[PDB]
PDB file of C-alpha atoms and ligand atoms in Angstrom:
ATOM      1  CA  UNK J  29       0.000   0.000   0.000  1.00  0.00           C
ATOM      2  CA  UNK J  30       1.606   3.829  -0.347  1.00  0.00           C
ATOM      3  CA  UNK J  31       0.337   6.591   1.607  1.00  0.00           C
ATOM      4  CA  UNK J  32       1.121  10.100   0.491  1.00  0.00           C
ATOM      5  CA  UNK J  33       1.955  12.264   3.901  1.00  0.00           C
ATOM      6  CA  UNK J  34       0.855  15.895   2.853  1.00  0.00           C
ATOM      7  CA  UNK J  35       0.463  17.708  -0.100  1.00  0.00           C
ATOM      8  CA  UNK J  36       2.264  20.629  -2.086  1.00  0.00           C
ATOM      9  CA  UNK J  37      -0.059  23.133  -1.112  1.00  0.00           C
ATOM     10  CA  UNK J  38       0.559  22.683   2.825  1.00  0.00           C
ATOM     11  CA  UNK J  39      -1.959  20.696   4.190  1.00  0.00           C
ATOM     12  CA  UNK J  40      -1.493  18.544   7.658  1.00  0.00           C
ATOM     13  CA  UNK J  41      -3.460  15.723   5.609  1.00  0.00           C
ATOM     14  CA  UNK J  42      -2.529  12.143   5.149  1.00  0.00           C
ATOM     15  CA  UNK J  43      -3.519  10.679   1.762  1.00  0.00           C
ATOM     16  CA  UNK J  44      -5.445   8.656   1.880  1.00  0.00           C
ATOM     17  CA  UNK J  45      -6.277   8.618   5.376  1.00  0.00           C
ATOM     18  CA  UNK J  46      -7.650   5.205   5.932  1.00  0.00           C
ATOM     19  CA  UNK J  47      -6.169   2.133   3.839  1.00  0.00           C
ATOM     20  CA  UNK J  48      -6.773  -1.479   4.099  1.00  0.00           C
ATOM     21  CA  UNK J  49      -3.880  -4.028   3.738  1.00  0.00           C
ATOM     22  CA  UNK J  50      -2.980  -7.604   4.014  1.00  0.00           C
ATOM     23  CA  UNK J  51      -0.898  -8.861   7.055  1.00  0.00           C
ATOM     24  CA  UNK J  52       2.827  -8.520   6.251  1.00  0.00           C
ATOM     25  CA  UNK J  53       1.899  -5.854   2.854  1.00  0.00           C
ATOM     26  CA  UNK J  54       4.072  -3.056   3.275  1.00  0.00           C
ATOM     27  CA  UNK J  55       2.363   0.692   4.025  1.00  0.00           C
ATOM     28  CA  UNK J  56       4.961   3.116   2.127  1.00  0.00           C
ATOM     29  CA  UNK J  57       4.313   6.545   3.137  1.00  0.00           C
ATOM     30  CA  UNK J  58       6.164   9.077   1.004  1.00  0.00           C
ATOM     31  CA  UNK J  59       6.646  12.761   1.593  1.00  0.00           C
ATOM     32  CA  UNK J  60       4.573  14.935  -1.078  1.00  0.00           C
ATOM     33  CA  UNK J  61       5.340  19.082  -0.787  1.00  0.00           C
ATOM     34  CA  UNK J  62       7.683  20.972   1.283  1.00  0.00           C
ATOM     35  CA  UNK J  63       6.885  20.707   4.465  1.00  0.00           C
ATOM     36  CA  UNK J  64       7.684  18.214   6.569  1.00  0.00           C
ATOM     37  CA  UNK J  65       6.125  15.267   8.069  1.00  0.00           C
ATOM     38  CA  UNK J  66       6.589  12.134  10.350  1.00  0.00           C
ATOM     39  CA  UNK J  67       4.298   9.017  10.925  1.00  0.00           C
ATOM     40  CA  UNK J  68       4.135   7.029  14.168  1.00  0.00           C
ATOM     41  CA  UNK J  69       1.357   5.031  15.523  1.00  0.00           C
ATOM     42  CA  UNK J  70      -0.618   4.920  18.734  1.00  0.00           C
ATOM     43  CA  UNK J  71      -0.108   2.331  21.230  1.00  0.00           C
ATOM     44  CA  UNK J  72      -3.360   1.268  22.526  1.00  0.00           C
ATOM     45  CA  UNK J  73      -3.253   0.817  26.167  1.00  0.00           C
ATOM     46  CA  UNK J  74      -4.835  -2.709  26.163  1.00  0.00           C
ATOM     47  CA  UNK J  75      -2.460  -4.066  23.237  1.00  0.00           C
ATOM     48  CA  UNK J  76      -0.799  -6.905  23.733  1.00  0.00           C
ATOM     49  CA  UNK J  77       2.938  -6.548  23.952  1.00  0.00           C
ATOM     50  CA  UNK J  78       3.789  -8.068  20.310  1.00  0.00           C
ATOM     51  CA  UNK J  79       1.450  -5.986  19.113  1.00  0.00           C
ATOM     52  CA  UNK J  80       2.951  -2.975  20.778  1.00  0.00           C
ATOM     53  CA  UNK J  81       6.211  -4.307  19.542  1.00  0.00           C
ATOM     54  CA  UNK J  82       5.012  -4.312  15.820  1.00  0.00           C
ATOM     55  CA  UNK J  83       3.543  -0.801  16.722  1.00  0.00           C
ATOM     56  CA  UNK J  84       6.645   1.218  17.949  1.00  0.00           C
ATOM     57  CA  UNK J  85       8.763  -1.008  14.538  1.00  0.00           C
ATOM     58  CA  UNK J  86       6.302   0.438  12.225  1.00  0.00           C
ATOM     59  CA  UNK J  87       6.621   4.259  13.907  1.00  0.00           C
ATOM     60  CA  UNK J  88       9.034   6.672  13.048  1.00  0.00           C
ATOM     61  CA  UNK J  89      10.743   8.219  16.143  1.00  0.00           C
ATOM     62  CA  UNK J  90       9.385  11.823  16.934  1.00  0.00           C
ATOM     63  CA  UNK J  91      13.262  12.992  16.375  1.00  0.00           C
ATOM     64  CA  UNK J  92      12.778  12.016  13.002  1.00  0.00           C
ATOM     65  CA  UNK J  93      11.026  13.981   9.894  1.00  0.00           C
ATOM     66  CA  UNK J  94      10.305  13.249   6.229  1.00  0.00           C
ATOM     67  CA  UNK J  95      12.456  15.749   4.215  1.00  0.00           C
ATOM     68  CA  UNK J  96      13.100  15.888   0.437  1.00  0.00           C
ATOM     69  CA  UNK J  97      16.039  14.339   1.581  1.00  0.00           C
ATOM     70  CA  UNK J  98      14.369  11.020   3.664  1.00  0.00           C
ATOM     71  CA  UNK J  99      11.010  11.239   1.475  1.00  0.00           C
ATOM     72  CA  UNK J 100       9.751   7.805   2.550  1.00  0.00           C
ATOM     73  CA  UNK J 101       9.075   5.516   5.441  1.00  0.00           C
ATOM     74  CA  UNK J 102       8.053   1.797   5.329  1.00  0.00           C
ATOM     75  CA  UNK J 103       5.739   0.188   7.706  1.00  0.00           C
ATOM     76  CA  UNK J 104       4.414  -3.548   8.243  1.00  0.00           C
ATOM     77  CA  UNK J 105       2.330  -4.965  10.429  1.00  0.00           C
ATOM     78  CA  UNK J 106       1.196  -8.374  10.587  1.00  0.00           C
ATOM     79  CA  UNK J 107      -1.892  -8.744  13.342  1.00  0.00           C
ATOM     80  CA  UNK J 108      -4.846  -8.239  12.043  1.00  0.00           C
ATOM     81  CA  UNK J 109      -6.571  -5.183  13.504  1.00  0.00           C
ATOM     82  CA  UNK J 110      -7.830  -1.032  12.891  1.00  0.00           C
ATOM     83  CA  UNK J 111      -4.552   1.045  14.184  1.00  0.00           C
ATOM     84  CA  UNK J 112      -4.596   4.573  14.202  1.00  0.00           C
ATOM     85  CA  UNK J 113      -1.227   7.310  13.247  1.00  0.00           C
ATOM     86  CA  UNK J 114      -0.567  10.326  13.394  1.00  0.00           C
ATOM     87  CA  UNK J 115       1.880  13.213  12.500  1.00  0.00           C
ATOM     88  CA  UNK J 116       4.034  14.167  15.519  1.00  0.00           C
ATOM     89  CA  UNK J 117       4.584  17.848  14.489  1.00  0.00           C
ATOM     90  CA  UNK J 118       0.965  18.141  13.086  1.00  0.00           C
ATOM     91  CA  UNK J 119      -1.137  16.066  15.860  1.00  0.00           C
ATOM     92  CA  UNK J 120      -3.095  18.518  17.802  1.00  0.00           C
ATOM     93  CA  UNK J 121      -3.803  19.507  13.754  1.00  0.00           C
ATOM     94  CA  UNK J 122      -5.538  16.418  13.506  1.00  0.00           C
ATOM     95  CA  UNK J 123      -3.283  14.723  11.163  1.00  0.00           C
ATOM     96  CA  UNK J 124      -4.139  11.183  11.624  1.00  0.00           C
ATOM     97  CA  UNK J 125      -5.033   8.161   9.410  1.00  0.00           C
ATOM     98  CA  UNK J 126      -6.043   4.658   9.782  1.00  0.00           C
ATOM     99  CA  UNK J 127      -4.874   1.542   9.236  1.00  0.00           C
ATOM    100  CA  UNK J 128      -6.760  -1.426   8.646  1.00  0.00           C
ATOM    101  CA  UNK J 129      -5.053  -5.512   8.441  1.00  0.00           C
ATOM    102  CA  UNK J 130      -6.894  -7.915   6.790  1.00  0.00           C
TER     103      UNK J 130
HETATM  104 CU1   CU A   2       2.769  16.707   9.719  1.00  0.00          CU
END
């Protein structure tokens, strides 16, 4: 699956926001525009530790951003599930998506 994490016009927007893949498919999210952009998902208190484990693999660190230089990031998760992420700069901007495993 590829995500496309903002736009060239400047909005906090994932696109799309919700995507549906199979366990183990690969969620690319590449940097579209200027500025820049992370991805890291939320840990759902209640998760079982693998699952928070797969969670934090597939997140970028909120050090890191999306530049022109580092355009992409590549996420997998394998148990099935509905897992939210958002954009650590852009958060409180609601920049958030969805992520559904078949
Ligand atoms: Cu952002």
């Amino acid at each position: 699956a590829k995500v496309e994490v903002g736009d060239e016009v400047g909005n906090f927007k994932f696109y799309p926001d919700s995507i549906t893949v199979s366990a183990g498919e690969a969620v690319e999210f590449t940097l579209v525009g200027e500025t820049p952009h992370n991805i890291v998902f939320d840990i759902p208190a209640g998760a079982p530790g693998t699952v928070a484990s797969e969670l934090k693999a597939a997140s970028m660190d909120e050090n890191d951003l999306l530049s022109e230089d580092e355009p992409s990031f590549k996420a997998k998760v394998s148990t099935p599930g509905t897992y939210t992420f958002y954009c650590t700069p852009h958060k409180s901007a609601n920049m958030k998506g969805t992520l559904t495993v078949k």
